[PDB]
Design a protein around this ligand. Structure first.
Ligand SMILES: [Cl-]
Ligand SMILES: [Cl-]
Ligand SMILES: [Cl-]
Ligand SMILES: [Cl-]
Ligand SMILES: [Cl-]
Ligand SMILES: [Cl-]
Ligand SMILES: [Cl-]
Ligand SMILES: [Cl-]
Ligand SMILES: [Cl-]
Ligand SMILES: [Cl-]
Ligand SMILES: [Cl-]
Ligand SMILES: [Cl-]
Ligand SMILES: [Cl-]
Ligand SMILES: [Cl-]
Ligand SMILES: [Cl-]
Ligand SMILES: [Cl-]
Ligand SMILES: [Cl-]
Ligand SMILES: [Cl-]
Ligand SMILES: [F-]
Ligand SMILES: [F-]
Ligand SMILES: [F-]
Ligand SMILES: [F-]
Ligand SMILES: [F-]
Ligand SMILES: [F-]
Ligand SMILES: [Mn+2]
Ligand SMILES: [Mn+2]
Ligand SMILES: [Mn+2]
Ligand SMILES: [Mn+2]
Ligand SMILES: [Mn+2]
Ligand SMILES: [Mn+2]
Ligand SMILES: [Mn+2]
Ligand SMILES: [Mn+2]
Ligand SMILES: [Mn+2]
Ligand SMILES: [Mn+2]
Ligand SMILES: [Mn+2]
Ligand SMILES: [Mn+2]
Ligand SMILES: [Mn+2]
Ligand SMILES: [Mn+2]
Ligand SMILES: [Mn+2]
Ligand SMILES: [Mn+2]
Ligand SMILES: [Mn+2]
Ligand SMILES: [Mn+2]
Ligand SMILES: [Mn+2]
Ligand SMILES: [Mn+2]
Ligand SMILES: [Mn+2]
Ligand SMILES: [Mn+2]
Ligand SMILES: [Mn+2]
Ligand SMILES: [Mn+2]
Ligand SMILES: [Mn+2]
Ligand SMILES: [Mn+2]
Ligand SMILES: [Mn+2]
Ligand SMILES: [Mn+2]
Ligand SMILES: [Mn+2]
Ligand SMILES: [Mn+2]
Ligand code: NA
Ligand code: NA
Ligand code: NA
Ligand code: NA
Ligand code: NA
Ligand code: NA
Ligand code: NA
Ligand code: NA
Ligand code: NA
Ligand code: NA
Ligand code: NA
Ligand code: NA
Lengths: 175, 175, 175, 175, 175, 175
């Protein structure tokens, strides 16, 4: 199953991301279940918002919110929930939510999948609008769900993103 | 063309709404052009948000923002931009934006189109979530567009909605 | 507007069909308004059914149900409501509904648009499943709408279809 | 795999439903294969009909038609085939088909996923149109498939639905 | 109708493009009819190809193929056939087809619609992949339609694109 | 998982095909991963092309390109990536690509799923356009990916298709 997908071929520079939610999709917040590897409906989000990129996680990692580390993956066409994409980290939106520190990595498709993103080396190379849209999404998408909240702490670079990937991997390792 | 569509068969209780944007659609903000009756792209909205209902206007009306009065129309399936739907007003979100007072009517499909909405007589009969989603949309959808802004002033009932329809009609009449 | 589209380049063998409803679409029953040429929502259909083909009419014709003659147009991909397709009649489903005799022509895309349908010369060349699906649709799609009903009278050939096209044209002519 | 999903967290009041067919989808009748847990095409349905709700089953149950008990799940947006949704039973359409007694449960998203359905406590709280659409679907969707048929026996309440869930669970247990 | 849309607010730098075909759509080749302003199906294209950008024309212009000058418009989300978008020319693919010289302009959404494309000043600023995809599309999309063909002659810059816009306008003027 | 799906119920006449890419979809080239059974993004294809049929493979087979044998499956509606369809082989497009001989089987839905394809007994019964579209797709879809290429060698009949299925099965058996 997806439970057996490696974190990556050469972490943290070469990772696999398991997709749960496509970019620009209906507000169904799917999460993979750790036990079964199945896609569960976590919730129907209450705001009229969509994820600006495909959204998922790195397998065999653990954030402080008790889930694998979260990843946004821009692509030319939305991905299928439950599919896996090889990518390269380029930046990270630091943020905290009701479940703990909960960073949002941005990783682009690996050069082997496409040349489209090769030019995006670091966080400054991401379009300013996309970055603004992502921060605005995480700032507001929980606005109508009581007991759910976010404190966005800011954008950081590809090396901070890599550091977060290592830490999350090591954390799933030693817990 | 759509330029020749009546405001309604018996205003303000029985109106026609010209749809510009479907519910739950991509963030393309279409507006009908007054001159040609064609659907123009006003803009690509910058936030990752969607209209909670189909969105358009009552022909032969004028708001203080210099456009025909705006209407949200809930339906079971999204409508085609440029189509026209017979409806019944049930409530209004009072609000102001950078172009003037700019109320958002809510009108449901007429009984003749469907029985689904007959039970919605007044604003209190609208689902609380939908109303919350609409106010949250108008509060935030201009957050990333400089020089565009909104002050949401609150929900009011079917009679206030009807009053607004009359006023907007009379205004297109005497300007 | 669509109000000015000819019935066809050489009726009844070479016709234009104005599309109102795409094949396999949501159950929104659009009808063009004769006055304005705009697409109106006639109703939200109540059964969980879809049109097996794109559905519309021949302009400048009149059936006994007081509307232009109805046409089903099979295509490889669903058409846009309000678009126009050049076609060739191949058969007709005779039927009556609450508004009068109300035949359903089947016309395929003209050879100039595609070679795909050239082999369909007459009604027997239509797939048996499609014909069965169309009759079953018209038999049941009004089952949950009181005061709406259908009596399906059977399939007839391309020459009967042509005769119906002529009659409907002549009727719009002399009324 | 989906083969390992529990019937529920607290049956019969708190269940999981494995979705096979989304609401308002193309007429591809997917069924999960018991052996592999994969989604198989059972058939391409022959009528021009769609499921009024998402459709699937409760894992680790068995109906008299030799399959897990069937469930319809209304949601605001169609679900992905192969996804799992936590729900609450509210009613049941009793019916028989060519494979045995084959009830159709209706279960709404659990409060934890959404508040939208909390107000639906029992079968009378379901919209009359949706219930009519579901009965009409099961009455007719097999009309063009020889050797497939249905006898719809009627709507019953949340306690009958719960009783059916218990019986189906116990049956998978003791066979 | 769309027949009355200006070529632009300040040609050739500020133009309007009437869209006939969305980006990444089914292979239905719609063309606006000059007489009626309606969207007609020109043909169902025979290759398994899609337009890499939204496709349409500048009103009140004339190419040597006897149609208004053709335009590709990249956008973040596909546009509706029959809609109009304000844009800025940035490049041109020179090519000839069976109907005459038939250049393909590329024009991006005007800054007023979006800031996304402001950075694209000239043809070299267009992504190399998109340009390659467009040339490959026009080279092959007529491969399976006998009597239809293309000779692609190459990419040229924003000033050549502007020159072509002027010439096409002047040609509709003096014929 | 899909790793455990049989090659078929009675090879080579009665096979199962695991679908990776739907017909007429976005150009995301998914491949099932042999290790995990998960759907991976192999690449984002560079040409503006789509698969004319659903595309996938026969499990427990091996081609000379080191992957299971490839299959195109025409259906009335596109299939879900990761779903499985029972089918009957009717023809084969012989071709070679950069990874080895790499035939493309065509197999239609089994009679048990639908009667629609029963009339297609052999390769000559496939529509000429579909066959032309498939050959044109494989001839050009790698045109913009350096180091990827195809030599299409021609269409052959249902018995050649069956022979290829046997050979590929036996090859996965003895390697
Ligand atoms: Cl790992
Ligand atoms: Cl979060
Ligand atoms: Cl930002
Ligand atoms: Cl009026
Ligand atoms: Cl507004
Ligand atoms: Cl509110
Ligand atoms: Cl005429
Ligand atoms: Cl009818
Ligand atoms: Cl029949
Ligand atoms: Cl269980
Ligand atoms: Cl059933
Ligand atoms: Cl009922
Ligand atoms: Cl002009
Ligand atoms: Cl061309
Ligand atoms: Cl190029
Ligand atoms: Cl096997
Ligand atoms: Cl290949
Ligand atoms: Cl061929
Ligand atoms: F998470
Ligand atoms: F407005
Ligand atoms: F009619
Ligand atoms: F079942
Ligand atoms: F043209
Ligand atoms: F392969
Ligand atoms: Mn959305
Ligand atoms: Mn969560
Ligand atoms: Mn997560
Ligand atoms: Mn979180
Ligand atoms: Mn998280
Ligand atoms: Mn959206
Ligand atoms: Mn505006
Ligand atoms: Mn407005
Ligand atoms: Mn406004
Ligand atoms: Mn306004
Ligand atoms: Mn439908
Ligand atoms: Mn009617
Ligand atoms: Mn009609
Ligand atoms: Mn009728
Ligand atoms: Mn009629
Ligand atoms: Mn459908
Ligand atoms: Mn079954
Ligand atoms: Mn079942
Ligand atoms: Mn059954
Ligand atoms: Mn059953
Ligand atoms: Mn396509
Ligand atoms: Mn042309
Ligand atoms: Mn053109
Ligand atoms: Mn041309
Ligand atoms: Mn041209
Ligand atoms: Mn496509
Ligand atoms: Mn490959
Ligand atoms: Mn393969
Ligand atoms: Mn290959
Ligand atoms: Mn292969
Ligand atoms: Na979407
Ligand atoms: Na909250
Ligand atoms: Na949408
Ligand atoms: Na703003
Ligand atoms: Na559909
Ligand atoms: Na009726
Ligand atoms: Na649908
Ligand atoms: Na039957
Ligand atoms: Na598409
Ligand atoms: Na050609
Ligand atoms: Na598609
Ligand atoms: Na190549």
């Amino acid at each position: 199953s997806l439970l057996n997908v490696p974190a990556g071929k050469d972490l943290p520079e070469d990772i696999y991301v398991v997709i749960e939610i496509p970019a620009n999709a209906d507000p169904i917040k799917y999460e993979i279940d750790k036990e079964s590897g199945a896609l569960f409906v976590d919730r129907f989000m209450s705001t009229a918002m969509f994820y600006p990129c495909n959204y998922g996680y790195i397998n065999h990692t653990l954030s402080l919110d008790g889930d694998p580390v979260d990843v946004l993956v821009p692509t030319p066409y939305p991905l299928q929930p439950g599919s896996v994409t090889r990518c390269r980290p380029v930046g990270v939106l630091k943020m905290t939510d009701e479940a703990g520190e909960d960073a949002k990595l941005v990783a682009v498709p690996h050069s082997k999948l496409s040349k489209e993103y090769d030019h995006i080396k670091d966080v400054n190379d991401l379009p300013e609008l996309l970055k603004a849209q992502i921060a605005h999404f995480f700032e507001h998408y929980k606005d109508l769900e009581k007991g759910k909240w976010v404190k966005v702490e800011g954008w950081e670079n590809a090396e901070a993103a890599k550091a977060e990937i290592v830490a999350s991997f090591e954390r799933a390792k030693n817990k």
